[PDB]
Structure formats: structure tokens, C-alpha cells
């Protein structure tokens, strides 16, 4: 049995009920800090959120609640962007804990989703999301913004994932109060 | 299992040589000699070179390729000397005839070409000339007897570095063999039965026209079809090119192909699907492969080593949401990890039947080795895509496209 850098849901993604507004590409990036995960298409922002307060949701951003029911397989480009914004939110929330007792040159930041982790050119972890067979697949790879042994890559992805989820073998990206993508590291059976 | 890994060794795929000599290593052309060879009448035309470059030219094309006193060792099953002995073909080169040209490049080369005396015309020049005037030269000499073979000054200089002197000569004698009208090898056609006669059309885009490089399952017969486009091939263009390819296949073989394999660098489009099912109806099976030379996958090994995974590892994931009776055709996905093949490959398979994924993996590996430029590790790619793209590149310079069907693979290779 071999390992990999892939985490993915063990079941088909349930239908994603998404709210929407009309208008943006920079807006979706910024509002991902607070918990609003959206994708910009047909001049609209189709988004999910973890904010369980309509007034605060409006203040951060009319909002068509539950306006669409996306199937990710038929709308891979929607689900991928929403998932990436949710992942960025998760990492942003954990950044304060991560950067507690580390040197100022050894502090993680966000620049897919890239965590520029060690700057000299900086080496970091890049995240990619693919929808396949109505399932979500997340890839984390060591990148430079070069060629290293497999061990120095495995131990790098392990650090980045452990400092996000606390366990290397899973990660939970929350899309909304009712939808949470639970991904598990996949061990490709020989 | 729907998502697993396996090992597909190169020994299961093969290439053929004289008298049905089979081995998985293309570089063993030196052992079993070219499958169907010809005679090489060489013409070397050094362009803007200093003395040392001319001594290097004589060293390479005269002492290493002709003189038996210069006992050059060859990669595998070597005896000595040069082309005429190891390959068993008639190699003729006169070092006193080397032409000195002070370069307008194409005209200067052309005045120095003698098609009545020579089959091959090696052109030696620095990297800038070998890049600006490679495809232009290949196109400008379509239909002529002489086929050109470019060699840079840098490769000649590397003949002094010992290790490079022991690896460069073969990936130029094999190309000389190919450009003389010879066949270094043909693909082991037996590989296309684990996948479950046919075509292997590769789709490229001359940036505009669509290029379909059609070929048999052993790469013995080849033909380019060029269809203007008014990336994906529209329905009308794909229908036309498929009809033309099937006509050629029936002309050469005598029947329509029972299985059409297609290669692209983009996912199958709706128009391509409609055209495929319109020309092929429901009787002829089709496999379509969207291939990328990159993969986000990064598979790691166990802790008893430094997380190293044996080369040849292939990751199969069969899409369960597949049903060909309602327009759903994306069958599976194959990730060929590789260090030989320099790049990893990801293959989105579309299929009208239960196409075996390791079958298409073997297709892609046998099409990697099918390339006659398989030596020179850097240039290792899928054959049909590679030469479809070569034809796409040189089509920008061909004027009378009506000659495209007559063009040979050796005029682009």
C-alpha cells in the first residue's frame, strides 16, 4: 500500500445549496476571511457561509437565500472555487495559533491556496481542488515561489497539514452550517 | 477496486526489428538492427563554423560513422567502427565533400543540395540557426528526395566530453536511418488486445487548422490529414477528418478499423463526441484519450526507504458515473508516474465500451517507445501527439496543403 498527497471525500458530495447575489473577483477573495465562500459566474456571486446571522452576513457583504442547488459534478468550476475559499478561511483561522512561538522569518502566510512557509523565493504548500466522479479531491504539494528528496516533501506536507487540521490523515473544510467536506488522506491500495 | 495502483513494466510492451526481433528497449536498434532499413547517402553542410567545428564534423560523420580504425563503442551489443557494420546498412559519406556555407539560409542550403546523389542532407549550424530554420527547412523540402537532419554546434562540441561522445552518436544514426526511408522499428501490435486492427489518430492544432496524424496500430503506415477550422475540432472538421482517415485505412488494409484510438491534450468536446458517433455510428468502438504531461498527484513510499516509489507505478481511478448509452463517456483516469519517460502523464479516457485502464496505460507507453527519437531521453513523448504537433508546426510554412496526404512521417521527423 502506497501513500500520496491526496485527501478526498469517501462519498459523493451532497447537493450544495448556495445563496447568491448579483453584481467582484477581489470581493470573493476578501470575504473568505470572515466565512463567506463564493464563486463569481454569470455576473453573480454564488456563495455558502458559516455565518449564522443574517444581519452580520449583510453587514459583511439582497441575498437570495438557498437560491440554487448545485450538483458539483455538473458545476465543477463552482464547487472548486467555493471549496478553495472555504479552505482559505480555515487556514486564515488557524494562522493565529500557528504563528504563536515562531521567529518572524518562520511565520506562515497566504499568497489555489498557497502557504508561503519559509522565505529566503519562498518554499510553501500549494493546494489544488478537483471534482471527479462527484467527489472532491485536494492535493497538497511543496512548491517554490526546488527538486528535493521525497522525504523532504513528505515531511513538509505533513507539517503543513498537521498545523492546519491537527492530524495528517484528514481535513475538514466547512462550507456552511449544514455542509462540511470531510477529506481523508488516501492510501492507494496496490 | 475503483481507485488503486499497479506496476506496468516496459517488458510487456515492445518494438520490432529485423526478422521479428522483439525487445522493449528501442535503443537496442543497434543489437537487432533497423526493422526495415535502407541506404544512407549523406551530405553534410556546415554553416558558419570555425576550424575546430569542421574537425568535429569530420570526427563525427567520418571517423565514428565510417572509419573502422576509429573503433567507436556503441551503446548496446557493440562491435566497433560505424554505421555500415552495426546497423547493416550502406552508409556513404565523403569527408572531402563537406560543403562550407557562409550565410537566405534556406536558399544557400538548397543550392548545395544534390538530390540525384544523396538521400540525406545533414545541416550543421549554431543553435540560433538550427532553431530559426528547422521547421522552415523541413517544410521547404517536402516531396524532394533529400531529407534534412539538423545538428547543432553544441552537440558536436559534446563529442569531446567522453560521456556525451558515448550517447550522442546513436540518436543521430537512428534519425539518419529514419530519414533515409528506413524503419527503426514498429510497435508490437499485440499490445492492443489487453485494451479489451484500428487507427491511432493524434489531434494537434496548427495555430487555423486541425491536424490529424493517422497511423496503424504498429505505426508502419502514417498519414496526415489537415482540416481548416472555422481547443477542440468542430463537428464538421472532425467528421471530414475521420471519413478521410477511414478511407485511407480501408485503402491500405481493406476494411474499416474496428477500433479508433484518439489522442488530444484537451478533454473531449461535445462536437467531437457527436462527430465520432456520427462517422462511427455504433459499430466501430472508439477510445479517446486526453493526455497531460503533468499531475498534481505526488505518490510517496514507505518509511523503510526515503519515501521512494518504484518507477512504473500507475494510479488507476475508474469513474463510476459512466454510462455510454446516454452520452456519458468519461470512463477512467490513469496517472503514469515516471522519472524511461521523463514526465508523469495523466490520461482522461473516454470510451464507448468497458475500456481497460491499464490497457490505455500500455497504449501510452508503447506510443512513447514507438517514437523513433526515443533515444535522447529529453524528447520522449507520445508518438501520435508528438508528430501531430510537428506537422502542425511545419504546416505554417507549407503552401500547397493538397500535398499533406502524401507527406511522410520522415519529412517532419
| Residue B336 exposure: Cα atoms within 13 Å on the Cβ side | 30
- CB of B289 closer than 8 Å to CB of B360: yes
Cα–Cα distances in angstroms (integers) from residue B64 to residues B79, B95, B152, B302, in the given order? 13, 12, 17, 47
Write out chain A residues lying below 8 Å of B299, CB-based.
2-5, 188
Write out chain B residues lying below 8 Å of A186, CB-based.
3
- Name the nearest CA neighbour of B120 among B173, B37, B183, B179: B179
How many CB atoms are closer than 10 A to CB A176?
A: 21
What are the phi and psi torsion angles at A60 (to 5°)? Answer: -60, -40
Q: Which one of A2, A142, A160 would you mutate to disrupt binding with B, by most B Cβ within 10 Å of its Cβ?
A: A2
Q: Does A149 touch chain B (CB under 8 A)?
A: yes
> Computed from CA positions of residues B273, B278, B279, B281, in that sequence, does the dihedral angle turn out positive or negative?
positive
Distance between CA atoms of residues B239 and B321, nearest Å: 27
Question: Which residues in chain A precede a discontinuity of more than 2.5 Å between C and N?
Answer: 23, 61, 111, 120, 145
Q: What is the dihedral of CA A71, A73, A76, A81, to 10 degrees?
A: 50
Strand order in B209-215's β-sheet? B3-7, B313-318, B330-336, B345-351, B285-292, B259-264, B199-206, B209-215, B222-228
Cα–Cα distances in angstroms (integers) from residue B143 to residues B111, B124, B140, in the given order? 17, 22, 9
- CB of B308 closer than 8 Å to CB of B337: no
Cell of A113: 491556496
- CB of B132 closer than 8 Å to CB of B32: no
Say if residue A86 is exposed, middle or buried (CB neighbours under 10 Å; 0-12, 13-18, 19+). Answer: buried
Closest-CA distance, B309 to chain A, in angstroms, reads 8
Return residues 150-179 of A near B (CB < 8 Å). 150-151, 153-154
Cell of B197: 486492427
Q: Which domains does chain B have, with CATH numbers?
A: 3-15+186-411 (3.30.420.10), 37-179 (3.40.50)
Distance between CA atoms of residues A49 and A32, nearest Å: 9
Strand order in B21-23's β-sheet? B21-23, B15-17, B186-187
Across B179-274, where does the E strand assignment appear? 186-187, 199-206, 209-215, 222-228, 259-264
Say if residue A96 is exposed, middle or buried (CB neighbours under 10 Å; 0-12, 13-18, 19+). Answer: exposed
Write out chain A residues lying below 8 Å of B313, CB-based.
2
| Residue B232 exposure: Cα atoms within 13 Å on the Cβ side | 15
Say if residue B376 is exposed, middle or buried (CB neighbours under 10 Å; 0-12, 13-18, 19+). Answer: middle
> Computed from CA positions of residues B230, B233, B235, B241, in that sequence, does the dihedral angle turn out positive or negative?
positive
Helices B235-253 & B270-279, crossing angle to 10 degrees?
A: 40
Is A70 contained in some domain? yes
Distance between CA atoms of residues B201 and A13, nearest Å: 36
Say if residue A47 is exposed, middle or buried (CB neighbours under 10 Å; 0-12, 13-18, 19+). Answer: buried
Say if residue B176 is exposed, middle or buried (CB neighbours under 10 Å; 0-12, 13-18, 19+). Answer: buried
Q: If you measure CA to CA, which chain B residue comes closest to A7?
A: B297
Helix runs in B100-256, H state only: 105-111, 127-132, 135-140, 153-157, 170-179, 235-253
Distance between CA atoms of residues A112 and A126, nearest Å: 7
**CB pair distance less than 8 Å for B301 and A150:** yes
**CB pair distance less than 8 Å for A150 and B307:** yes
Write out chain A residues lying below 8 Å of B319, CB-based.
132-133
User: What are residue B290's DSSP bridge partners?
Assistant: B264, B348
- CB of A144 closer than 8 Å to CB of A111: no
Give me the numbers of helices (H) and strands (E) for chain A, helices first please.
4, 10
Share in percent of chain B as helix, strand, coil (round to 5): 35, 25, 40
Is A62 contained in some domain? yes
Name, in order, each residue with C-beta under 8 angstroms of B376's C-beta and a sequence gap of 6 or more: B171
- Name the nearest CA neighbour of B118 among B87, B93, B83: B93
Say if residue B19 is exposed, middle or buried (CB neighbours under 10 Å; 0-12, 13-18, 19+). Answer: exposed
DSSP, collapsed to helix, strand or coil, labels residue B33 as coil
Q: If you measure CA to CA, which chain B residue comes closest to A112?
A: B296
Write out chain B residues lying below 8 Å of A3, CB-based.
299-301, 307
- Name the nearest CA neighbour of B190 among B352, B34, B369, B15: B15
Helices A76-98 & A150-165, crossing angle to 10 degrees?
A: 80
Distance of CA B62 to the CA centre of its chain: 27
| Residue B71 exposure: Cα atoms within 13 Å on the Cβ side | 3
Distance between CA atoms of residues B368 and B386, nearest Å: 10
Distance between CA atoms of residues B130 and B145, nearest Å: 21
DSSP B301: -
- CB of B370 closer than 8 Å to CB of B386: no
Name, in order, each residue with C-beta under 8 angstroms of B45's C-beta and a sequence gap of 6 or more: B98, B99, B101, B109, B112, B113, B121, B122, B123, B124
- CB of A180 closer than 8 Å to CB of A53: no
- CB of A190 closer than 8 Å to CB of B309: no
DSSP A147: -
Is A71 contained in some domain? yes
Structural domain including A164 reads 6-185
Distance between CA atoms of residues B141 and A170, nearest Å: 60
Is A176 contained in some domain? yes
Write out chain B residues lying below 8 Å of A73, CB-based.
321
Please name the member of A2, A132, A133 whose beta carbon is closest to the beta carbon of B5. Answer: A2
- Name the nearest CA neighbour of B92 among B122, B70, B112, B72: B122
Closest-CA distance, B394 to chain A, in angstroms, reads 35
H/E element, A181: strand A180-185
Q: If you measure CA to CA, which chain A residue comes closest to B315?
A: A188
Instruction: Please identify which residue in the block is written with the cell numbers 553542410.
Output: B45
Is A46 contained in some domain? yes
Distance between CA atoms of residues A127 and A118, nearest Å: 16
Q: If you measure CA to CA, which chain A residue comes closest to B1?
A: A189
How many residue pairs bridge chain A and chain B with CB atoms within 8 Å of each other? 65
Write out chain A residues lying below 8 Å of B308, CB-based.
150
Instruction: Please identify which residue in the block is written with the cell numbers 471534482.
Output: A131
Is A91 contained in some domain? yes
DSSP, collapsed to helix, strand or coil, labels residue B318 as strand
DSSP, collapsed to helix, strand or coil, labels residue B32 as helix
Cα–Cα distances in angstroms (integers) from residue A102 to residues A45, A54, A105, A159, B199, in the given order? 38, 38, 8, 14, 61
**Opening angle at CA B333, ends B12 and B319, nearest 5:** 125
Write out chain A residues lying below 8 Å of B5, CB-based.
2, 188-190
Distance between CA atoms of residues B147 and B43, nearest Å: 10
Instruction: Please identify which residue in the block is written with the cell numbers 488530444.
Output: B264
Name, in order, each residue with C-beta under 8 angstroms of B281's C-beta and a sequence gap of 6 or more: none
- Name the nearest CA neighbour of B111 among B119, B120, B122, B99: B99
- CB of A161 closer than 8 Å to CB of A171: yes
**CB pair distance less than 8 Å for A2 and B297:** no
- CB of A8 closer than 8 Å to CB of A183: yes
**What Å resolution does this PDB entry report?**
2.7
Distance between CA atoms of residues B394 and B412, nearest Å: 8
Write out chain B residues lying below 8 Å of A150, CB-based.
300-301, 306-309
**CB pair distance less than 8 Å for B300 and A190:** no
Cell of B109: 542550403
- CB of B84 closer than 8 Å to CB of B90: yes
DSSP B241: H
Is A190 contained in some domain? no
Question: Which residues in chain B precede a discontinuity of more than 2.5 Å between C and N?
Answer: 103, 196, 207, 230, 339
**CB pair distance less than 8 Å for B321 and A141:** no
Number of domain units in chain A: 1
Which residues of B have a CB under 8 Å from any CB of A? 1, 3-6, 296-302, 306-309, 313, 315, 317, 319-321, 333
Q: Provide the b/e sequence for A153-171 (b: ≥16 CB within 10 Å).
A: bbebbeebbebbbeebeeb
Is A1 contained in some domain? no
Asked how this structure was determined, the answer is cryo-EM
Q: Which one of A141, A150, A158 would you mutate to disrupt binding with B, by most B Cβ within 10 Å of its Cβ?
A: A150
Q: What's chain B's length in residues?
A: 413
- CB of A16 closer than 8 Å to CB of A70: yes
Write out chain B residues lying below 8 Å of A188, CB-based.
3-5, 299, 315
Amino acid at each position: 500500500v502506497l501513500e500520496s498527497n491526496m485527501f478526498k471525500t469517501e462519498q459523493e458530495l451532497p447537493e450544495l445549496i448556495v445563496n447568491c447575489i448579483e453584481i467582484a473577483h477581489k470581493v470573493v477573495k476578501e470575504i473568505s476571511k470572515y466565512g463567506i465562500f463564493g464563486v463569481v459566474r454569470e455576473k453573480k456571486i454564488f456563495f455558502t457561509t458559516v455565518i449564522e446571522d443574517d444581519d452580520f452576513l449583510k453587514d459583511r457583504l439582497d441575498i437570495k437565500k438557498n437560491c440554487k442547488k448545485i450538483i458539483p459534478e455538473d458545476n465543477k468550476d463552482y464547487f472548486s472555487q467555493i471549496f478553495l475559499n472555504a479552505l482559505r478561511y480555515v487556514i486564515y483561522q488557524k494562522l493565529e495559533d500557528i504563528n504563536k512561538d515562531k521567529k518572524e522569518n518562520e511565520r506562515w502566510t497566504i499568497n489555489g491556496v498557497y502557504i508561503c512557509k519559509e522565505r529566503y523565493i519562498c518554499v510553501g504548500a500549494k493546494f489544488t481542488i478537483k471534482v471527479f466522479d462527484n467527489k472532491a479531491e485536494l492535493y497538497v504539494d511543496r512548491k517554490l515561489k526546488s527538486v528535493v528528496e521525497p522525504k523532504t516533501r513528505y515531511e513538509f506536507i505533513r507539517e503543513i497539514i498537521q498545523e492546519i487540521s491537527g492530524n495528517f490523515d484528514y481535513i475538514n473544510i466547512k462550507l456552511s452550517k449544514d455542509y462540511t467536506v470531510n477529506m481523508t488522506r488516501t492510501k492507494l491500495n496496490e | 477496486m475503483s481507485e488503486y495502483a499497479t506496476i506496468l513494466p516496459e517488458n510487456k510492451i515492445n518494438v520490432i526489428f529485423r526478422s521479428n526481433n522483439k525487445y522493449h528497449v528501442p535503443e537496442f536498434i543497434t543489437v537487432f538492427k533497423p526493422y526495415e532499413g535502407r541506404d544512407i547517402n549523406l551530405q553534410v553542410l556546415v554553416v558558419n563554423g570555425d576550424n575546430e567545428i569542421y574537425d568535429l564534423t569530420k570526427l563525427l560523420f567520418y571517423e565514428i560513422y565510417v572509419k573502422d580504425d576509429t573503433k567507436y563503442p556503441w551503446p548496446y551489443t557493440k562491435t566497433r567502427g560505424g554505421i555500415s557494420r552495426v546497423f547493416g546498412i550502406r552508409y556513404n559519406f565523403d569527408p572531402s565533400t563537406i560543403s562550407r556555407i557562409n550565410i537566405d539560409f534556406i536558399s544557400s542550403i538548397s543550392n548545395q543540395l544534390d538530390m540525384n546523389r544523396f538521400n540525406v542532407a545533414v545541416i550543421i549550424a549554431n543553435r540560433k540557426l538550427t532553431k530559426e530554420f528547422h521547421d522552415k527547412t523541413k517544410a521547404a523540402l517536402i516531396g524532394s528526395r533529400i531529407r534534412t537532419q539538423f545538428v547543432t554546434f553544441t552537440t558536436l562540441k559534446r563529442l569531446k566530453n567522453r560521456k556525451y561522445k558515448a550517447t550522442i552518436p546513436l540518436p543521430l544514426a537512428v534519425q539518419l536511418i529514419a530519414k533515409a526511408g528506413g524503419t527503426p522499428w514498429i510497435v508490437d501490435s499485440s499490445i492492443y488486445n489487453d485494451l479489451s486492427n484500428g487507427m491511432l489518430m493524434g489531434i494537434a492544432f496548427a495555430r487555423t487548422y486541425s491536424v490529424g496524424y493517422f497511423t496503424t496500430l504498429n505505426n508502419y503506415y502514417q498519414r496526415f490529414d489537415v482540416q481548416p477550422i472555422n481547443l477542440y475540432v468542430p463537428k464538421e472538421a472532425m467528421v471530414k477528418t475521420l471519413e478521410s482517415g477511414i478511407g485511407w485505412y480501408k485503402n491500405i488494409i481493406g476494411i474499416t478499423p474496428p477500433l479508433l484510438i484518439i489522442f488530444k491534450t484537451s478533454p473531449m468536446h461535445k462536437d467531437e463526441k457527436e462527430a465520432i458517433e456520427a462517422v462511427l455510428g455504433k459499430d466501430i468502438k472508439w477510445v479517446f484519450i486526453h493526455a497531460q504531461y503533468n499531475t498534481p498527484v505526488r505518490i510517496f513510499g514507505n518509511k523503510e526507504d526515503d519515501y521512494k516509489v518504484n518507477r512504473g507505478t500507475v494510479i488507476i481511478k475508474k469513474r463510476k458515473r459512466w454510462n455510454p448509452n446516454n452520452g456519458d463517456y468519461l470512463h477512467s483516469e490513469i496517472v503514469i508516474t515516471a522519472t524511461g519517460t521523463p514526465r508523469p502523464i495523466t490520461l482522461n479516457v473516454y470510451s464507448s465500451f468497458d475500456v481497460n485502464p491499464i490497457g490505455v496505460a500500455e497504449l501510452t507507453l508503447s506510443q512513447i517507445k514507438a517514437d523513433w527519437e526515443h533515444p535522447d531521453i529529453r524528447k520522449r513523448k507520445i508518438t501520435v501527439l508528438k508528430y501531430a504537433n510537428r506537422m502542425a508546426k511545419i504546416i505554417q510554412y507549407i503552401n500547397n496543403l493538397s500535398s499533406v496526404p502524401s507527406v511522410d512521417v520522415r519529412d517532419v521527423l
